UniProtKB/Swiss-Prot annotation:
The chain holds residues 103 to 214 of 1014 of the full protein. Changing residue 112 to N: Abolished cleavage by caspase-7 (CASP7). A zinc finger (PARP-type) spans 11-101. It is found in: Chromosome. The modification Phosphoserine is found at residues 75, 77, 83. The modification N6-acetyllysine is found at residues 3, 29. It comes from Homo sapiens (Human). The gene is PARP1. Changing residue 36 to E: Abolished binding to DNA strand breaks. This cleavage form irreversibly binds to DNA breaks and interferes with DNA repair, promoting DNA damage-induced apoptosis. This is Poly [ADP-ribose] polymerase 1, processed N-terminus. Zn(2+) 2 binds at residues 23, 26, 57, 60. There is a cross-link at residue 101 (Glycyl lysine isopeptide (Lys-Gly) (interchain with G-Cter in SUMO1)). A motif (Nuclear localization signal) lies at residues 105-107. There is a cross-link at residues 90, 101 (Glycyl lysine isopeptide (Lys-Gly) (interchain with G-Cter in SUMO2)).
Length: 112
C-alpha cells in the first residue's frame, strides 16, 4: 500500500466529541466541542497496556512537543485529520508549531 502525505503516522488531531479524553500534558479533562490532539506511544507510567493514543490540549501538546518527539520537518501539518478542522484552528496549531515546506510539500508545481 502507498505511503501517507497528510500525517507522519504517529500523532492525530480532531474536535473533542466527548469530555472522556483527558490531557496527559497537564492532567485536566479535555473540553467537548474544541480541538484535541494525541500521540501513539507506549504509556511510560503504565507500559503494560502498550501503545495508546495519549490525549493532550492544543497548548499542552506544543509544551511537551520535544518529549513527544516533534521536529520542524513534521509539525502540526502532519497530524491526522488536521485539514478537517476550522481554518482558525488550522492556523492557530501552525502558529504555535509550524511545519517546514522546503522538502517540496507544496511548491505550486504538483498538480498545476
Ligand atoms: Zn492540558
Amino acid at each position: 500500500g502507498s505511503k501517507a502525505e497528510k500525517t507522519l503516522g504517529d500523532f492525530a488531531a480532531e474536535y473533542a466529541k466527548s469530555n472522556r479524553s483527558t490531557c496527559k500534558g497537564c492532567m485536566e479533562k479535555i473540553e467537548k466541542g474544541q480541538v484535541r490532539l494525541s500521540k501513539k506511544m507506549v504509556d511510560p507510567e503504565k507500559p503494560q497496556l502498550g501503545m495508546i493514543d495519549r490525549w493532550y490540549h492544543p497548548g499542552c501538546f506544543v509544551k511537551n512537543r520535544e518529549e513527544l518527539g516533534f521536529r520542524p520537518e513534521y509539525s502540526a501539518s502532519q497530524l491526522k485529520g488536521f485539514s478537517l478542522l476550522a481554518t482558525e484552528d488550522k492556523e492557530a496549531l501552525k502558529k504555535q508549531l509550524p511545519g517546514v515546506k522546503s522538502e517540496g510539500k507544496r511548491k505550486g508545481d504538483e498538480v498545476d
